């Protein structure tokens, strides 16, 4: 698990940088990016 503390605003744009690192999922919550490793 691998939470980061950023003002997201659409789940598309950490989307790319989760995959970047390698990670299995990439969701937004309005507010903070939750990524989860692979």
Excluded: Y
């Amino acid at each position: 698990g691998v939470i980061i503390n950023v003002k997201c605003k659409i789940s598309r744009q950490c989307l790319e940088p989760c995959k970047k690192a390698g990670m299995r999922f990439g969701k937004c919550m309005n507010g903070k990016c939750h990524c989860t490793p692979k």
